[PDB]
Write an enzyme that holds these catalytic residues in place. Structure first.
Site, PDB file in Angstrom:
ATOM      1  N   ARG A  44       3.519   4.073  -9.845  1.00 40.06           N
ATOM      2  CA  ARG A  44       3.736   2.669 -10.175  1.00 40.06           C
ATOM      3  C   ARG A  44       3.724   2.466 -11.680  1.00 40.06           C
ATOM      4  O   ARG A  44       4.509   1.678 -12.221  1.00 40.06           O
ATOM      5  CB  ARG A  44       2.654   1.789  -9.528  1.00 40.06           C
ATOM      6  N   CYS A 102      -3.722   2.566 -13.491  1.00 37.82           N
ATOM      7  CA  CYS A 102      -4.432   2.575 -12.207  1.00 37.82           C
ATOM      8  C   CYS A 102      -4.001   3.826 -11.452  1.00 37.82           C
ATOM      9  O   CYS A 102      -3.109   4.556 -11.916  1.00 37.82           O
ATOM     10  CB  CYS A 102      -4.195   1.322 -11.368  1.00 37.82           C
ATOM     11  N   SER A 103      -4.650   4.103 -10.317  1.00 40.27           N
ATOM     12  CA  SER A 103      -4.343   5.302  -9.543  1.00 40.27           C
ATOM     13  C   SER A 103      -4.297   6.502 -10.482  1.00 40.27           C
ATOM     14  O   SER A 103      -5.135   6.621 -11.382  1.00 40.27           O
ATOM     15  CB  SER A 103      -3.010   5.132  -8.812  1.00 40.27           C
ATOM     16  N   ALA A 104      -3.277   7.341 -10.338  1.00 39.00           N
ATOM     17  CA  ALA A 104      -3.112   8.502 -11.215  1.00 39.00           C
ATOM     18  C   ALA A 104      -2.319   8.182 -12.477  1.00 39.00           C
ATOM     19  O   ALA A 104      -2.171   9.054 -13.342  1.00 39.00           O
ATOM     20  CB  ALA A 104      -2.429   9.648 -10.467  1.00 39.00           C
ATOM     21  N   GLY A 105      -1.803   6.965 -12.598  1.00 34.02           N
ATOM     22  CA  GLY A 105      -1.130   6.580 -13.816  1.00 34.02           C
ATOM     23  C   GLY A 105       0.243   7.194 -14.020  1.00 34.02           C
ATOM     24  O   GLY A 105       0.651   7.362 -15.166  1.00 34.02           O
ATOM     25  N   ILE A 106       0.982   7.497 -12.946  1.00 34.76           N
ATOM     26  CA  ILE A 106       2.314   8.096 -13.100  1.00 34.76           C
ATOM     27  C   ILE A 106       3.356   7.416 -12.216  1.00 34.76           C
ATOM     28  O   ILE A 106       4.520   7.270 -12.614  1.00 34.76           O
ATOM     29  CB  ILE A 106       2.279   9.619 -12.836  1.00 34.76           C
ATOM     30  N   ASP A 124       0.819  -1.217   0.000  1.00 39.23           N
ATOM     31  CA  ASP A 124       0.000   0.000   0.000  1.00 39.23           C
ATOM     32  C   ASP A 124       0.853   1.268   0.000  1.00 39.23           C
ATOM     33  O   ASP A 124       0.420   2.298  -0.531  1.00 39.23           O
ATOM     34  CB  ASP A 124      -0.940   0.050   1.208  1.00 39.23           C
ATOM     35  N   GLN A 165       7.620   8.467  -9.315  1.00 36.71           N
ATOM     36  CA  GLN A 165       7.281   9.509  -8.358  1.00 36.71           C
ATOM     37  C   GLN A 165       8.293   9.674  -7.231  1.00 36.71           C
ATOM     38  O   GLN A 165       8.505  10.796  -6.766  1.00 36.71           O
ATOM     39  CB  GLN A 165       5.900   9.222  -7.758  1.00 36.71           C
TER      40      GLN A 165
HETATM   41 CL   LIG Z   1      -0.143   3.977 -11.126  1.00 31.70          CL
END
Ligand SMILES: [Cl-]
Ligand SMILES: Cc1nc(N2CCC3(CC2)CO[C@@H](C)[C@H]3N)c(CO)nc1-c1cccc(Cl)c1Cl
Ligand SMILES: [Cl-]
Length: 501
Positions: free
Chosen positions: A441, A435-439, A401, A482
């Site tokens: 992972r 997924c998430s914001a796409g930047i 997480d 990130q």
């Molecule tokens: Cl992501």
């Protein structure tokens, strides 16, 4: 224009710097060195200094009381151009005057304690005409040396290395005459624009910092050991971060009114010049060409980096998969993490069939592996049975997480399988990673994939340059990769992949 980030400053030093060298509206940003992914925005207001926490666990920069951003430069740009937005008890905090840092640590050309003998070897074995670096002086502490290579790149005496002494006299730097600069960076920028000319005419052109991050794949283990010493990883990552100001490309389409609610986070937006443009949209929809997604082209496989769907973009996601002839999707998060939706379900239950606007999807079969679930999907356009194609959805489910996996083996075996699936499908389109914001992972998976594809094809006889690859991907979507933890993870994954060759 990222001088407002100070990598080696404390909270005490920040306050004193704003209070003695700044005015109301001055600001700087700084890391919490002990707590990774924690940053502070320190702002002077009404003669006092406010500290605002910025947190990044791996998906985006989360500014307390503010919004979420793909990079600190995009954050600062946003509030320097949208006033009254940053609030405390709710009082507005103005970002007016960046307080510029003079520390050369995160400059691409600065190598700190490096001897003249080492500097010449590096320039000789790795440099070309105009390659340069700055090092701390070995004879006189406080002084520096600028070493430059000039000559013909076509050894034979056609090239040379010139050393220029930089003195520190009353907190200013000079090369022995002329202007006196408040920092090494000012000095270097000045002599990049106005090159020194030697007696007899050699122009000491500062063309590019010396490439020291490009290494042979077999050298990766030694590099990781050097970078791991108590940390060289942090200095190299923050040197890469300093260059994110070169990447403030326009994101106008994602800011349009009709597109605002198609973004998971309103300020995390696709660059206009690489965004996926959707055609054949509903003629009755005014703006139907938009999805928060970017093409990532390595510069044989390409990618689409995109966010986790929203309920109102599921149909657009499938229009994108269909239009780009994508046959493989990588999901980087669970649907739900920490009780929060990270990737809304956009595929049918196993064996079930659903229509998503004009697109029809069957979930043929799900297969569980240790780190991921495979869903075999059949995608087609309603009314056109001959358009059906299988889309293999690889759902990675064990990423922690917060932070990164303790071991890259699971990620590598996953990418290895994804790669073989993609390679088995003639004329398959780009691999979708999302997924998430796409930047975060998403960028990390993509960069690992690009690097191991090099090693897979060329084995140990190839050069790898991790920050160059990352900078190249970040020029196509904001903030790809990130955190420093992800940065180290990329190195560790590359190293692991080489070892198991
Ligand atoms: Cl992501
Ligand atoms: C991230 C990076 N680091 C480099 N290093 C390592 C770290 C230091 C400077 C030199 C060395 O010593 C430290 C104190 C620090 N100043 C170099 C030089 O090639 N390049 C890059 C690079 C590569 C490609 C694209 C982009 Cl955008 C970048 Cl920034
Ligand atoms: Cl170079």
């Amino acid at each position: 224009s990222r001088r407002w980030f100070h990598p080696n400053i404390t909270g005490v030093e920040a306050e004193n710097l704003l209070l003695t060298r700044g005015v109301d509206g001055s600001f700087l940003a700084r890391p919490s060195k002990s707590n990774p992914g924690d940053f502070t925005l320190s702002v002077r207001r009404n003669g006092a200094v406010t500290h605002i926490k910025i947190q990044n666990t791996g998906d985006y920069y989360d500014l307390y009381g503010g919004e979420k951003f793909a990079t600190l430069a995009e954050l600062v740009q946003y509030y320097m151009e949208h006033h009254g937005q940053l609030k405390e008890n709710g009082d507005v905090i103005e970002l007016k005057y960046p307080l510029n840092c003079a520390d050369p640590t995160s400059e691409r050309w600065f190598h700190g304690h490096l001897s003249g003998k080492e500097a010449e070897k590096l320039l000789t074995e790795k440099g070309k005409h105009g390659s340069f670096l700055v090092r701390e002086s070995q004879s006189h502490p406080g002084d520096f040396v600028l070493s430059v290579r000039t000559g013909d790149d076509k050894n034979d005496g056609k090239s040379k290395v010139t050393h220029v002494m930089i003195r520190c006299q009353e907190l200013k730097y000079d090369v022995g005459g002329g202007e006196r600069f408040d920092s090494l960076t000012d000095l270097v920028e000045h002599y990049k624009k106005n090159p020194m000319v030697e007696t007899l005419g050699t122009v000491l052109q500062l063309k590019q910092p010396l490439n020291t991050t490009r290494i042979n794949a077999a050298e990766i283990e030694s590099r990781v050991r050097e970078l791991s010493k108590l940390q060289g990883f942090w200095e190299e990552f923050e040197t890469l971060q300093q260059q994110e100001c070169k990447l403030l490309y326009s994101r106008k389409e994602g800011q349009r009114q009709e597109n605002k609610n198609k973004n998971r986070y309103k300020n995390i937006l696709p660059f206009d010049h690489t965004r996926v443009v959707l055609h054949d949209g509903d003629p009755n929809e005014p703006v139907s060409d938009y999805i928060n997604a970017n093409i990532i082209m390595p510069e044989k496989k390409s990618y689409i980096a995109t966010q986790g769907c929203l309920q109102n973009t599921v149909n657009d996601f499938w229009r994108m998969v269909f239009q780009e002839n994508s046959r493989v999707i990588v999901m980087t998060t669970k649907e739900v993490e920490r009780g929060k939706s990270k990737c809304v379900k956009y595929w049918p239950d196993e064996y079930a069939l659903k229509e998503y606007g004009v697109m029809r999807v069957r979930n043929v079969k799900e297969s569980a592996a240790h780190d991921y679930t495979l869903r075999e999907l059949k995608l087609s356009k309603v009314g056109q049975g001959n358009t059906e194609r299988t889309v293999w959805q690889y759902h990675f489910r064990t990423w922690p997480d917060h932070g990164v996996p303790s071991d890259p083996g699971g990620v590598l075996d996953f990418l290895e399988e994804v790669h073989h699936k993609q390679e088995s499908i003639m004329d398959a389109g780009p691999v979708v990673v999302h997924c998430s914001a796409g930047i975060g992972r998403t960028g990390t998976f993509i960069v690992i994939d690009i690097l191991i594809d090099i090693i897979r094809e060329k084995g140990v006889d190839c050069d790898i340059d991790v920050p160059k690859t990352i900078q190249m991907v970040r020029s196509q979507r904001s903030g790809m990769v990130q955190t420093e933890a992800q940065y180290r993870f990329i190195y560790m994954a590359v190293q692991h992949y080489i070892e198991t060759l």
